[model samples]
Target: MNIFEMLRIDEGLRLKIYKDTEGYYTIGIGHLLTKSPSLNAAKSELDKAIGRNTNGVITKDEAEKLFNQDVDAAVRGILRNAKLKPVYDSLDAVRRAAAINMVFQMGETGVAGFTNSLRMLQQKRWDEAAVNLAKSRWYNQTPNRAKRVITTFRTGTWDAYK
Candidate 1:
C-alpha cells in the first residue's frame, strides 16, 4: 500500500493537509488530521497512506478522492502516536475526524503545546478548556484561524468558514 493508503489519506485530505518532508508525510498528516471532521475515515486510511503524499505535491482531485473512506485506523494511529485521548470518549464522527485532520496538518509537537487546553479537557474542565483554547497562543496568534477550529469543536460543525 502507498503512503496515502497507509496513513489513511482517503479520509478527507481537505479537512487536513499539513506540510511535511516529501517522504513520510503521514507523520505530519497524522499530527494535523487529529482535529478534523473526518477523523474516523482519516484514521482508517493511515496504514495505507504511508508514502502517500511524500512527493510534496498532491492534486486537488486526488485529495478529494481520498478521506471519504470509513474506518478508525487513521484516528487510532494518530491518537496512539500523539498520546491523546478523545475528550469525551469519542467525538461526533465528523468532529472527531476534523480534529484528526488538524493534527495531521500540525504535528505532535505543535499539538503538544496545547497543554493548558488539553489539561483542562482531560480534567473534564470544559469551561476552562474552552476559555484556555480561545486564549491559547495558537489562538491569540491566529485569531480568525483559531476561531475557525474552535467553532467546529464548540458548535460541532464547520461554521468557522461563515
Candidate 2:
C-alpha cells in the first residue's frame, strides 16, 4: 500500500468527531478542526463539505477530501520550513513519505523540533536518525508508530508498514 493508504489506517477513520488524545476537537482522519484560524468558520466549512450541520460528524467522501487536504498542507508546511527545506530536498521519495507521516502526527514544527534527527537525515545518517527518533518523547508516547517510522528511515524502504 502507498503512504496515503498507510496514513488512513494509522490515523484511523472517525466519521463522527471525537476528542483526540490531546483533547482537541477533531474529525475525519485526525483533522483538528479546533486549530483552524476560526473555529466557527471551520465548522461551517465542515458542514458544507458533508452537506449537513451535524456537529462532530462527517461522511467518508468528505473525510477523504479533508484527509488529502491536510496531507497536502503537511507537505507544504514541511517544505515551507527553512530548517526542513534542505532536509526535504535530500530525502528520497520513500523517506519523503515518511516525513509527511511524522508531520501528520505532530505538525511540522513538532517534527522540526527533532533537530538532531533532521540533521542526521540530511546527512544520510539513517541509523542515527532512527536512534534519535527512539530517544524522543514522541517515541515514549507511541512506540509502535515510532518504530515503524524509524524502520522506514533506517531501511530507506516503504516496507516497514502496510
Candidate 3:
C-alpha cells in the first residue's frame, strides 16, 4: 500500500473521542480537539449519522469519511498558515507532507512555537529543521511519529519510521 495509506493504518482508526497516550482529546485517527473546524464538522456529521436528537457511536465508514475531511482541512489550514509563508512553498512533496502531518498532530499554534525549526526550514537546512523538530516534547511523546516526519524532513523520502 501507499505511504499515506500506511500512515493512516499507523494512526489507528477511532470512531469516537478518546484520550490518547498523551491525554489529548482525540478522535478519528488522531484529530485533536484544537482542530475546531474538523471537530465541529465531525460533530455535525455524527449528528446526522445518528439523528437530529440522538447520540451514538460512529461506524468505521463514518469515521473514515470524517478522518478524510479532517485531513483535507488540515492540508488547507497548513497552506493558509501565514507563519509558514515562503518556506512552505519551497519544500519538496515529501517534506511538505511532513510539515502538514506535523501541523495535524500539534496544531498550527504549537508548530508555530518552533521558531528555530521554521527558520531552519526557511533556510533550506532540512537536517537542522529535522533536528530542531526532534527537540520538542512532541517527539518525546510520540517518537515513532516524530521519526517518520523528521525522516521526511531530513531525506525528503516517505520511508516508514521503525
Candidate 4:
C-alpha cells in the first residue's frame, strides 16, 4: 500500500473545522492549527491552501497537500534520531513504514523508547522483535493499530495493513 494512503486511514480524514481529543483546532486528517499558533493564522494559511479567500471549509486537494507535508515529519523524525536512524535505515520499505507509523503516533523519543524491539529489528530477529513490540504500553493502549505496525516490522511486508 502507499505510505501516505495507509497513514490517511489511520489518522482519519476531515475537511471541516473540528476539535480533536487534545482540544486543538484540527482539520484535514490530524493537522493541528497549532502549526500556525492561532485560529487567525491557521485560517489565513488554510485559505491559501483552499485558494478561496473564504471561511475554513477545506478542500480534499488542500487536505491531501497538508497531510503529505505534515506527515512527512514522521519519516524524517526516524532519521533525525541519532540512536534510531541506522536501525530505521536497515529496514525494508514496508518495515520502514512500520517504524515511521510508530513515530507517527508517538514522537521520536517515545519511539526510541522501544529499545528491545528495535534492537531485535536490527538483528533480524523477527520473533523477538514482535515479542518485545507487544510487551509494551503501546500494544496495551492501541492493541489493533500497534499490532498492525508490529506485524509489518516482523514480516517486512505490507500485508498487515491490508
Residues 1-162, candidate 2: write the lDDT tens digits: 667987886788888766676666678888877754555666776676667886756679888988888999998998899988789889998888888899999988898899988999999999888888899888898888778888888988867685
Which candidate, 2 or 3, would have the higher lDDT against the true structure? Answer: 2
lDDT of 4: 0.79
In candidate 3, what are the lDDT values of residues 37-148, reduced to their tens digit?
4546546555764455324356676667766777787777767788874567887777777777777667778887888998898788987888888888999988887887
lDDT of 1 at 75: 54
lDDT of each: 0.48, 0.82, 0.70, 0.79
Off by more than 4 A, model 2? 35-52
Best by TM-score: 2
TM-score for predicted model 1 compared with the true structure? 0.48
Candidate with best lDDT: 2
In model 1, which range of ten residues has the least summed lDDT? 20-29
Rank order by TM-score, top first? 2, 4, 3, 1
Model 2: pairs clashing at backbone N, Cα or C within 3 Å: 17-56
**Residue clash pairs of candidate 4:** none
TM-score per candidate, in order?
A: 0.48, 0.87, 0.78, 0.79
